Amino acid sequence: GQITGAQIVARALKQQGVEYMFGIVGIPVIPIAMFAQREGIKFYGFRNEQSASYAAAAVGYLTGRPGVCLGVSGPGMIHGVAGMANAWSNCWPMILIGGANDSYQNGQGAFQEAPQIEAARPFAKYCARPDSLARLPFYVEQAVRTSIYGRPGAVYLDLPGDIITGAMEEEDVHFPPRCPDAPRMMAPQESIDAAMAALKSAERPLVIVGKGAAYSRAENEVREFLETTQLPYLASPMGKGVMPDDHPLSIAPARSAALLGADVILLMGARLNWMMHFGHPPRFDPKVRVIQMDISAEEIGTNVPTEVALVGDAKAITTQLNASLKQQPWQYPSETTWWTGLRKKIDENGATVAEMMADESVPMSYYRVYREIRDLIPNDAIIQNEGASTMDIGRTLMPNFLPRHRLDAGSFGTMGVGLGQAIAAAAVHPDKHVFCIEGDSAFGFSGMEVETAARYGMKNITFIIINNNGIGGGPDTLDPTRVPPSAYTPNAHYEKMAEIYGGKGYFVTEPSQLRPALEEAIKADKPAIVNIMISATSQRK
Amino acid sequence: GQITGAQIVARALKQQGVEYMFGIVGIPVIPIAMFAQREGIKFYGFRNEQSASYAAAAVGYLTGRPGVCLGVSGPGMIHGVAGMANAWSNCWPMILIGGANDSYQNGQGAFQEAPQIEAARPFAKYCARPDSLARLPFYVEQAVRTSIYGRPGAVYLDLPGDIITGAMEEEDVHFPPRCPDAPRMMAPQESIDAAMAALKSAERPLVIVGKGAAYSRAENEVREFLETTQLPYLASPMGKGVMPDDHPLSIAPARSAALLGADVILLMGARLNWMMHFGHPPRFDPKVRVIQMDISAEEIGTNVPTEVALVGDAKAITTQLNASLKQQPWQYPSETTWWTGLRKKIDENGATVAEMMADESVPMSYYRVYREIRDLIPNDAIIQNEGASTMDIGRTLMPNFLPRHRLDAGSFGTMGVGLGQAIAAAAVHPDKHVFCIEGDSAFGFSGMEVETAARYGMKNITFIIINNNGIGGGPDTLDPTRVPPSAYTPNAHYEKMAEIYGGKGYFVTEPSQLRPALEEAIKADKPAIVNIMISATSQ
Amino acid sequence: GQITGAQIVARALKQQGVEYMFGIVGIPVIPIAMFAQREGIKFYGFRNEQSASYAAAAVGYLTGRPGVCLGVSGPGMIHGVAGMANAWSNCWPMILIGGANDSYQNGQGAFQEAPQIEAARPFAKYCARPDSLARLPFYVEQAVRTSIYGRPGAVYLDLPGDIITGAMEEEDVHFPPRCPDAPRMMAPQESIDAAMAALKSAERPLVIVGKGAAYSRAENEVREFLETTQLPYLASPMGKGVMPDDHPLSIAPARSAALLGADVILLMGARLNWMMHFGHPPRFDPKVRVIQMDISAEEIGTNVPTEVALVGDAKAITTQLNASLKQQPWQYPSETTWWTGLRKKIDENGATVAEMMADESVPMSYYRVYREIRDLIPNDAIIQNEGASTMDIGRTLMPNFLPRHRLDAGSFGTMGVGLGQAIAAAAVHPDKHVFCIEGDSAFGFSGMEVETAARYGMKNITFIIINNNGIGGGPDTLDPTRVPPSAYTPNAHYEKMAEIYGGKGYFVTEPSQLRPALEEAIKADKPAIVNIMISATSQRKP
Ligand SMILES: Nc1ncnc2c1ncn2[C@@H]1O[C@H](COP(=O)(O)OP(=O)(O)O)[C@@H](O)[C@H]1O
Ligand SMILES: Nc1ncnc2c1ncn2[C@@H]1O[C@H](COP(=O)(O)OP(=O)(O)O)[C@@H](O)[C@H]1O
Ligand SMILES: Nc1ncnc2c1ncn2[C@@H]1O[C@H](COP(=O)(O)OP(=O)(O)O)[C@@H](O)[C@H]1O
Ligand SMILES: Cc1ncc(C[n+]2csc(CCOP(=O)(O)OP(=O)(O)O)c2C)c(N)n1
Ligand SMILES: Cc1ncc(C[n+]2csc(CCOP(=O)(O)OP(=O)(O)O)c2C)c(N)n1
Ligand SMILES: Cc1ncc(C[n+]2csc(CCOP(=O)(O)OP(=O)(O)O)c2C)c(N)n1
Ligand SMILES: [Mg+2]
Ligand SMILES: [Mg+2]
Ligand SMILES: [Mg+2]
């Protein structure tokens, strides 16, 4: 009856709701990975901790419980800090478990001795180095609860080697119960009535449904709220799917005109950050009334004054708004100058998009490639879209129908999360298909992770590379003594990386090769790579 | 006419609700204090930034909007981080405005150049170095709003000298409006009913009223709650006053008894920290069920599992409880085996208290001295108690009837907040009398600030020193080569410091002098000091 | 036999050369202060850890081994970060020992649980929380060694409660030997001959003697080099005493003219920071050639380029400059246009200084008061001068004849170091007298420490308060509502604080009261206070 620290941590994580663990083993975190599998936690051995830390953050967004990134002492943990910042920026729960040198070797210049707690502090809600084996379950339970309660964030546990490998009696350790699900605070009664009056007194109302509404699991109530009020709504890049992107109330093609003309905006789990242009002119009405629904009280009132503050959980507050529509029913009129003005902009944009999508010139364009892509993604798949032009075009091109089904660079604009987040999507959804659509540069960050996807049999992932030979484009030839900083090797056969694990690679340059190569890639028994070449001068609209 | 960065900061502070500023002037924050008085902010020049930063955190607890501590670059700002940590520990809104060297001198070894941002960060919710003059009102509103929203805390603004001395067109500076009061969060209706179920099913219930409820300013709602349900309640040291200490529902004389045998406990703005012994045995039921009411979601479930999590503002949640109680009337029975057990200990403990306050022996004891102080403090006064035994015995002997009328060491257990919090209490309540009962050791931390109190005419403050010649006691004689590390000068006449500003000092050794000296000091036109000698053996 | 962690760290501190400890006791650092006295370390209980941490940094400058500031967990340690920063700014060795809650209570909201390592690190060369009891001497030896080797600085030791109270058999504890003194590296012969060739070519040379040369204890070698070369030298505020302030080679009364007209400058343990105007115009020649002698290689070349870099110990490199002169003797001539120019400004500034001292009017001025103070201070006493004008006017008027005999605000310009530094001076030098000349504003930062000085029988300290009723002056009548932010109580009786411990206070307001009150305060058997009133509108020599 002797239990080790790695055993205690592994069982504690499984008890507190951890199911997926990513990272790379080594001194001294080897036992933690072995016991994680022996306790019911799937461990995925990545090729670089940077990509593994991004996968851990994506699990916190998809499942509601934090994903664990395991890194060795010193540099292994430091690589994982990149993911901590991403979870810090996107408000996602995630745990970074970093090994450390033997505590009795501190100050001696031990192997991989580093100020790991201080390196994780700027992006962590919680840092801790446990003091004893018997109190390890206290730190794990506190680490999980801190990551999901309130505004979700990243936490870090510093595990010295002697605690990982030390042993003690099992009857003496105490395992706390699985901490309850994150409490859902509600808005005050008087504020819900004030939020309705502002919406009922709006000439040009607008609803913004963002990442916070998707993470809050509030898809049912938002669809009930919008369909009952018939309000025009705008989805964030990762709010797509909370409300179906083919819904009539969506004004996404007229995004710029809606934000510029709106006088009362309802924020549903979204922030007025760089993505929303800080809510300031010339993109917004300088006197726009703002109703903000957010779980963080400090976020309320950022950049733009907030007239009605709905501090609390997006799912708990939206039920109050739905409860307001029962003792006081109200619908927004279906024919106003605001509706007809917007609906003209959508039909104009959609005509321009289709006119650009139907162009078949070679070298191909984004819209031409995204036509064959869009018509082959099933309505229940998971889109992973990383890149610059590729990601932005696909945002408006590829629709989503279920919540939390699109993953991109997020609020931090991080390159390198792509293949990492795609593996996390296949670990959470092993029966659904994941489309990891990448640019040539973004794929180069975590490109070696294609072998990881195949080693765990994640054939539900199809890697699609939109290549234009550089960051925003590159030439057809390169002078080795005069390479542009953004240029890459022209016509780089990235798809030949599929031969590492015996998979299929496709090199597409003409619209005829597009659909057949894509069709056979999805049917493959191993993760296939489709490398599509486009024009370097191809741009947006 | 043009406006300077110092004048921009002062007006923006006043607009966002700042009314009190403490600190010491100097390079380069001198113009800030000048426009502070000019824009209507009461500035108080302290003797040390350490005591000033504690007065700032006290104003945040008393008013609901953060007091400001103004410190010079380098050493001045670093001294103010103490109060930042105190507000960080007590969840109080507080602002430290530390000057900096001119930005065009960074890296040159400028005057008082220091990593001030990194020094404040471990205790700050928000550190910011404003980038330009036009955006100064943006950072000021963001600092105040971040200090009072959510769980209150301390923030820090790094103001370089050139930002302070620079000027620009006044009409080109945009001042955001006064940010609204801290938004109230409410608990789900199912959580209210589950808390009522646990309280109704409780064999031995207990309500712990903490200072989080006092800061929430829910005294009117907590009294409607407890008076309706007749639940026995225990108030934290700074939770006193939310309910009058003479209320029959109080079980404070038997604190160690109720915490030991309470099957269901209701935490009303109270934290299960070291004060509550972590909610663990031997002082707690190993299976105690907790109904936790706190605004910080991360705090819920700490140390002890929380069955009913009432996350949100204490005033809004208590209002839900009262609304539920008047639609579903329930009262804890007045005759219970639980009521008859605590009441016996309350009567038994109260008997030993009376037999200790009747002690007339010289040197005196804590209980004899506090008996006369208790008889002379009105019901509307404010008590500031600091020390160890002096403060703990004063917690159980001083009665508080209005909320937020007692200021002690706080959740940090800080020695040095005494005179700072007393000065803050006198500036917020110039109409009430402020009692500052200090230990001789605690008085050494900030006793120089009696001049600050006298300089601003704060004759409503009475400094009472309870002197046992050291930290928990001191010997009668001292040899300089054999001074105990906890001993001070025997019979140190601290009251002589009242003669610095021409005040009255009093030296009491026998109970015959207690009442006359205390009554004479309250009537003094200048802040008087009463130095009371007590026995080093009394416990 | 079993030994506790408190006794392990107390013995290890004494073994590593720690002699003085300042702080305030309380949970959980009580056994440390008790066991320190049992092991030979002298503990001084202050009234505030802030003043104690300033006293601990002063011990490092006076002795070369770090003084220790002892603080309780949480707020006790945070108060002691001020001294860490002051030692960090002045490059002095200093150790802050802060308590911490029991390790088995982390994350529980324990009593005074705080992120103390992070609070100290911005000013720390070394932060460490010892992992076990048997390795406590390892962390003590490394902390001392780090604080004194290379560029000296402040270190921090984080001691949890159960590390202090735990015990184990004394045999298993390895006590490392007393770490050797700081090594004294030196410059190449090429750099030595180049620096000597630079001085030999200077039309208008100037030598700057900073407290880095004082800390290095190179007073004999500096006096041997300067008296051989006859080079005009300027002494920084705490660089005074390395050379006798009454030296014909001193051009301090003409500091502005010397720094401007100089074309070659030798930096002896002094930085080109705010105190030296960054070596920039209009106070310096734009084409000034600089020879910099500094222990820190990273400091070489700051603001102004360094033609000749002499990286190493000031005492070791000055020895090389003397060996080079013993083989190639060279003297700067004493009748140059550079000399006669500086002396013309010196004689005229000295006349204006002598005139302001002759003023007998009431209220008195800084010069009349210092005229009497200067004449009652022995040539081997220690000067603690803190304030604004009080500190700056005193530096020109208070001559120091021995190195490391003046303590002021330092490179950080700190208010609150005064009384703490005076107590540390008296503890190091109980034979010499300590004069603590303070401004009325500066005195209030740590005024309660007068009782600490009396409690330990420090009769060799005399507290002198130059009172102008505010920060740089103040009115003579105060309305309690309309209070200037820089003014204090008019005619405050700070001398009454001496009566706390039975001492004697003196309230001086006339010139005929200075000498009788000052002469009797020095001879008191308890530390006395002399509160001297001056004019609020009193300035310095323009
Ligand atoms: N369960 C929840 N209920 C309400 N708000 C939440 C919840 N979880 C996160 N949020 C808030 O949602 C916000 C995230 O918005 P953001 O991701 O920037 O919008 P976008 O979708 O445009 O990226 C955060 O400020 C966070 O506080
Ligand atoms: N407006 C508020 N409503 C509810 N809880 C609050 C509010 N403001 C602060 N709190 C909480 O009250 C708690 C105060 O507990 P503590 O400082 O330990 O006081 P005490 O122990 O004296 O009750 C903090 O944890 C804080 O999160
Ligand atoms: N033993 C030593 N030998 C040489 N230089 C030293 C030694 N100790 C410290 N120093 C240097 O002295 C410098 C201190 O300069 P500073 O305090 O600015 O002098 P001052 O204030 O007297 O002008 C530091 O840069 C430090 O590197
Ligand atoms: C970690 C990180 N590194 C770098 C960047 C900057 N960045 C943004 S997009 C991009 C390259 C885009 O690659 P790709 O998809 O090939 O470009 P596109 O063809 O879509 O323009 C880079 C380097 C970033 N946002 N994050
Ligand atoms: C900043 C700080 N320094 C030191 C302490 C340790 N401490 C706790 S209570 C106390 C003073 C106790 O003495 P006193 O105030 O005279 O009261 P007594 O208990 O003797 O009546 C001290 C120094 C602390 N809590 N905070
Ligand atoms: C910690 C700290 N707080 C504040 C200052 C600003 N400051 C510089 S000098 C000084 C005091 C000036 O008054 P005083 O000591 O009476 O000197 P005087 O003008 O009489 O010479 C102050 C507060 C500082 N340098 N350090
Ligand atoms: Mg590209
Ligand atoms: Mg005492
Ligand atoms: Mg003055």
Author numbering:
A (entry chain E): 2 to 542
B (entry chain B): 2 to 540
C (entry chain A): 2 to 543
What is written in the article reporting this PDB entry?
Originally identified in the mammalian α-oxidation pathway of 3-methyl-branched fatty acids, HACL/S has demonstrated remarkable catalytic reversibility, as it is capable of condensing fCoA with various substrates covering a wide range of aldehydes and ketones with different carbon chain lengths. All the enzymes are tetramers, specifically dimers of dimers (α2), where α2 dimer represents a catalytical unit.
We have determined ten high-resolution structures of enzymes from the HACL/S sub-family, including DhcHACL/S, CcHACL/S, TbHACL/S, CfhHACL/S, and ApbHACL/S and measure kinetic parameters for all purified enzymes. Based on the kinetic characterization ApbHACL/S, DhcHACL/S and TbHACL/S are the top three variants that showed the highest catalytic efficiency toward acetaldehyde. All structures contain well-defined bound ThDP and ADP.
